[PDB]
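Single-chain item
Fold in token form
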Amino acid sequence: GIPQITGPTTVNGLERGSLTVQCVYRSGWETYLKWWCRGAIWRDCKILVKTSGSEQEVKRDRVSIKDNQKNRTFTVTMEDLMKTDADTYWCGIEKTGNDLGVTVQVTIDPAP
């Protein structure tokens, strides 16, 4: 491979359902903080959750994140999906001056 950070181009979930996202990064970023932000513009990004750079799973409301440094891929999990969650998100990596990010498009379908 060659791109520093990777992820699915798009992900789909069902209303009240659950969806996960896997972002793979290359050697070197294992210790950086990892996060899931909402919004297409990186500047006014809406950070939903993030790790402290360790492998501890961190959860905030309906979003949890856990970094698997051996596999060099962190997993973002969104529970109890809502139709308003559909948006463009970012899988971001960051620490002491550096950061990478790749957008993931989230789609939500309804039942009833």
Q: What stands out?
A: The two ends are 42 Å apart (CA to CA). Strands lie at 5-6, 10-14, 19-25, 33-38, 46-50, 58-60, 63-68, 73-78, 87-95, 98-109. Residues 24 and 76 are 11 Å apart (CA to CA).
